[PDB]
């Protein structure tokens, strides 16, 4: 139906230049132009502008006519925006949705968002660590068994327990940076009966370094 | 002509829609003397065609000009001038004075009808033949008012459509015969429909039909068949699951004839439609929720029909790009078989949406149908609201 896949999410140190590619698909490109928005993170949705994609002319808001560049490859349906000089201050997720009408004051159908992140910070796998327990029977029947990952740059990781099959059970909370870092963690509960006996494993991929890593959280106690 | 019109001929086949006029005036109007105006239309002499329009009394340049988002002041004039021109300060026509008219040619002469007034002491003043002949006044006092399009004549008898009332509540429709100026009778709406406001009407085979708003409740239109003969009408929506007011829902699969479909109340925008059978057409925006964009679709029995789906369309205004009221206009003296169905699209630009500037204007496009199946452009105002900052 309508899908609007943005470009994966990229790192940039102050100062250089980003084209965020958004290739539009299941409507019609040249009836309805884009919108971008800027997702902050401390602050709410803030409307960048819109692209005729008719016509190739853009309106941009007042806090951003400038630095932000608005254009297309209409050939292939995809609007880009580009950002120059990225002062770090323009981190976010930026969006492309479209805009129903003339303007964009619907945004109907947005597109999955592209996180920047400008830091002059080096990329740095993770080292990723099983958290086996000292026994300790995790209420009735379970066993919470963990996997620390710890130390990378930047986000994103990819933490699956067992190949995606250990669905229910899990909290992978929430990566936190402490200072040029990041450090992530996620739980699953089991029951006893699956584990020692069935093979419970971490798989962790960080594509910036380009590591996939595969812990098995054997009994160590 | 020398003599009364009778609407003896029917509709002919439309096939495809072909540029019949386009007056560019925000363009000209960025440096010649080209007149603020808002709700135009179109209207038949048996001898010419020309625009109408509702003037506000200022140049696009002039100072005046900001603030002509108000509907209604005593600087209102309604206006005319030729086919494919400006309204121009040096050419329009004044035919009377008011903030609501309707206007249209019986075969001898002209009415012209214009409401001037405060919201609650309204008046109608019905010019016949360019001279006041009757007037009538506000019978709800809460803003009287009529079509915006052109009403049709047959056999001297010319029926109007007037709304004093609530346009956010039920409000007091009422059809009125003139003929040669005077009234012939007038008779209170009837019908399924719940309210009337800004009606299209076109005439074929001594019967008028009227494709209206429905301000509070409808997003599908009230359709008001009139018989100008017996003078007796009906009213019902349309009842295609294709919604042509605006804003509207999204089109259901199901529509609905006998009552308003449910979504967005006290709104809509004026409309029309050619209504008959295999051969009908509708023109609607093509945003939800704004005025931009315009087409042209074909859906068949549409008017009698909880079903029908489009099988056929054309572009006439790109949804990058604005319009506004449409309304019918058909040329009653233009020699053929049948009579060539047309529209005329009104091209909005100002305040709310480019605010940039502080006054609101338009410009005009019309069409008239063809059954060749022609090719189809898209026709844009033109301005850049950036030229006159
Ligand atoms: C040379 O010129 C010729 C002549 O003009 C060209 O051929 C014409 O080309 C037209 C466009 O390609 C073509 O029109 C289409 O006709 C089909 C019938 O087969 C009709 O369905 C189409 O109308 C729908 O689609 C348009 C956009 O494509 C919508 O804007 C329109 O609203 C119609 O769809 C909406 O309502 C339908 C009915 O309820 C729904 O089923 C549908 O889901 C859709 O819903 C959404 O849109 C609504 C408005 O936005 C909204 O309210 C609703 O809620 C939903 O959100 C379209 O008109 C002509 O048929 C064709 N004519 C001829 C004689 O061939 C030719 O291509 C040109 N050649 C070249 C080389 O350029
Ligand atoms: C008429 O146009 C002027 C600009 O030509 C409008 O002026 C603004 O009006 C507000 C009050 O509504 C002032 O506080 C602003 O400082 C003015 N500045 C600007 C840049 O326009 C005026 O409001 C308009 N409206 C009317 C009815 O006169
Ligand atoms: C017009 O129609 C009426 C009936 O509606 C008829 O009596 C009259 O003579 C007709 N006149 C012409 C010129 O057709
Ligand atoms: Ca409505």
């Known amino acids: 139906q309508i899908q609007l896949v943005q470009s994966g999410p990229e790192l940039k140190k102050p100062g250089e230049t980003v084209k965020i590619s958004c290739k539009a698909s299941?409507?019609?490109?040249?009836?309805?132009?884009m919108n971008w928005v800027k997702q902050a993170p401390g602050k709410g949705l803030e409307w960048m502008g819109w692209?005729?994609?008719?016509?190739?002319?853009?309106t941009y808001g007042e806090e951003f006519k400038g630095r932000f560049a608005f254009s297309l490859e209409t050939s292939a349906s995809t609007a880009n925006l580009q950002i120059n000089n990225l002062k770090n201050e323009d981190k976010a997720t930026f969006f492309c949705?479209?805009?129903?009408?003339?303007?964009?004051?619907?945004?109907?159908?947005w597109g999955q968002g592209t996180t920047l992140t400008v830091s002059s910070a080096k990329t740095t796998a993770p080292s990723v660590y099983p958290l086996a327990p000292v026994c300790g029977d995790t209420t009735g029947s379970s066993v919470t068994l963990g996997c620390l990952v710890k130390g990378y740059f930047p986000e994103p990781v990819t933490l699956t327990w067992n190949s995606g099959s250990l669905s229910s059970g899990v909290h992978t909370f929430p990566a936190v940076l402490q200072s040029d870092l990041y450090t992530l963690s996620s739980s699953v509960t089991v029951t006893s009966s699956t584990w020692p006996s069935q093979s419970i494993t971490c798989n962790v991929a960080h594509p910036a370094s380009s590591t996939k890593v595969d812990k098995k959280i054997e009994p160590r106690g | 002509i020398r003599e009364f019109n009778n609407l003896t001929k029917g509709l002919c086949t439309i096939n495809s829609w072909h540029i019949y006029g386009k007056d560019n005036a925000v363009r000209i109007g960025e440096d010649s003397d080209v007149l603020v105006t808002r709700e135009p239309y179109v209207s038949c002499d048996p001898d010419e065609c020309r625009f109408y329009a509702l003037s506000q009394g200022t140049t696009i340049r002039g100072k005046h000009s900001n603030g002509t988002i108000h509907d209604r002041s005593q600087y209102r004039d309604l206006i005319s001038w030729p086919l494919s021109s400006p309204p121009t300060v040096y050419n329009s026509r004044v035919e009377c004075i008011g903030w609501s008219s309707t206007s249209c040619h019986d075969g001898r002469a002209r009415m012209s009808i214009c409401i001037s007034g405060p919201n609650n002491n309204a008046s109608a003043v019905i010019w016949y033949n360019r001279r006041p002949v009757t007037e009538i006044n506000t019978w709800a006092r809460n803003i009287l008012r009529t079509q915006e399009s052109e009403c049709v004549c047959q056999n001297g008898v010319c029926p109007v459509v007037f709304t004093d009332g609530s346009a956010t509540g039920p409000a007091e429709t009422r059809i009125y015969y003139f003929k040669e100026g005077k009234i012939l009778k007038w008779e209170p709406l009837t019908g399924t429909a719940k309210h009337i406001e800004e009606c299209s009407c076109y005439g074929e085979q001594a019967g008028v039909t009227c494709t209206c708003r429905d301000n509070w409740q409808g997003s599908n239109r009230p359709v008001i068949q009139i018989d100008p003969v017996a003078m007796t009408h009906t009213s019902q929506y349309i009842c295609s699951p294709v919604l042509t007011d605006n804003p509207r829902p999204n089109d259901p699969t199901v529509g609905k004839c006998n009552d308003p479909y449910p979504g967005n109340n006290n709104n809509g925008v004026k409309g029309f439609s050619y209504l008959d059978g295999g051969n009908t057409w509708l023109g609607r925006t093509i945003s939800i929720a704004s005025r931009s964009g315009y087409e042209m679709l074909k859906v068949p029995n549409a008017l009698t029909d909880d079903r029908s789906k489009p099988t056929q369309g054309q572009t006439i205004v790109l949804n990058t790009d604005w319009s506004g009221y449409s309304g019918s206009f058909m040329d009653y003296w233009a020699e053929g078989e049948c009579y060539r169905a047309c529209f005329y699209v009104e091209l909005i630009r100002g305040r709310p949406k480019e605010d940039k500037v502080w006054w609101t204007s338009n410009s005009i496009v019309s069409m008239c149908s063809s059954t060749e199946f022609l090719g189809q452009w898209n026709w844009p105002d033109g301005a850049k609201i950036e030229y006159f900052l």
């Open positions: 949705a479209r805009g129903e009408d003339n303007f964009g004051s619907l945004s109907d159908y």
């Open positions: 299941g409507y019609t490109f040249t009836n309805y132009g």
């Open positions: 692209i005729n994609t008719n016509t190739g002319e853009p």
